[PDB]
Design a protein around this ligand. Structure first.
Ligand SMILES: O=C(O)/C=C\C=C/C(=O)O
Ligand SMILES: O=C(O)/C=C\C=C/C(=O)O
Lengths: 216, 216
């Protein structure tokens, strides 16, 4: 009769999160899990109100009532159509300064701060201004539009395996070009699903030769 | 100043549609294209009201005011977690009769008829009743949930390359196990974007050794 509600952002479906949940379900078959689509910002209130218990997000949205556990620093990639700027965009990587006059697809469409405002700030903190920004509802749609020819899109590396054809995923060479994956929990939540889900995290990361940023 | 509004269902982003739009955009750079997320049923009214001009769908939803142009018959696959029923579900394929007591994920959540009711009817027309059905918002989410361990999901073959890890895509051996991709247009629409988009279709299909069901 125990129900664990887990908030997640869409891009995490293409990474190791499904494996983490699968392992948790195997180890804890009595626990009913609800996977709930929820942005990192929206997870704050969702956690505070008891509407979710765990929140897997990608922004450093701090709150005294919330504990953030940083799991992994994922590198960012510029998604482009494979015939776009064969010479200007090297497969070895681009700096953000090179793509300022490209129509950029941001995502998702949601309460802010979110991944769109995060990607914007990467340009901003370098003194750069993208020429055109369009916010798209979800990551896979933004990638579909890149392939349809509506520009470029910065995504986490795990998005490389989203099944949209004819894209290249090019390294972003600037130092701040990472998206941290984190688990948010209520600060005074002492339920054992937290240490349990974290052990699943470390096990799955270990399988993939990833060292969690946090030691168990 | 000409704007072509194109309705599409999500799964088509992992197929040849983005290429078709990209080719059309190259050939017709003056035409502004809006890609609009829209179910096959909802496309009927959208086309009738002039809110879209072209509708790429996956159901035979007929209407006297709408012309349906069937492009491709795509085979269906059962998405499973790679460790689920190693013996019972052969990689060579399953019949729908074999999976009736599996929790099934349907998609999307939308106005009906839709892909969920379509998948249901495949069981129904064989006298079969799935033991549990849960409707999920979108295809990639249903696939994420399969990998998280919430059951199985019938998808078109092109969904095989959606980047969710640890899934197998198993043939469905029953005869009716296909999802037709079609273009819907207003019956009395004589705009040249129709013959133009169809020529793009045939060109892209040709590149991929696919013969359109309709000859140009
Ligand atoms: O907006 C956020 O809070 C972060 C990520 C959103 C979507 C994704 O990663 O798919
Ligand atoms: O519901 C429909 O009209 C057909 C397909 C829906 C979604 C998809 O293919 O992703």
């Amino acid at each position: 009769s125990q129900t664990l509600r887990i908030g997640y952002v869409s891009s995490l479906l293409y990474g190791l999160l499904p494996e983490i949940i699968y392992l948790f379900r195997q180890q804890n078959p009595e626990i009913h899990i609800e996977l709930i689509e929820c942005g990192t910002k929206d997870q704050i209130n969702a956690l505070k109100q008891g509407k979710i218990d765990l929140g897997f997000g990608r922004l450093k949205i701090t709150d005294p009532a919330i504990r953030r556990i940083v799991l992994h620093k994922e590198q960012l990639k510029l998604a482009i159509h494979k015939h776009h700027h064969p010479n200007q965009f090297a497969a070895t990587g681009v700096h953000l300064s090179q793509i300022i006059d490209e129509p950029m697809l941001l995502y998702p469409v949601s309460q802010k701060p979110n991944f769109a405002t995060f990607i914007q700030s990467l340009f901003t903190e370098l003194g750069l201004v993208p020429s055109k920004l369009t916010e798209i509802r979800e990551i896979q749609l933004a990638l579909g539009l890149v392939a349809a020819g509506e520009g470029v899109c910065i995504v986490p590396a795990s998005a490389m395996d989203i099944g949209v054809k004819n894209l290249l995923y090019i390294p972003i060479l600037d130092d701040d070009a990472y998206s941290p994956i984190s688990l948010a929990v209520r600060n005074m939540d002492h339920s054992n699903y937290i240490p349990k889900i974290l052990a699943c995290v470390q096990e799955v990361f270990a399988t993939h030769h990833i060292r969690p940023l946090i030691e168990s």
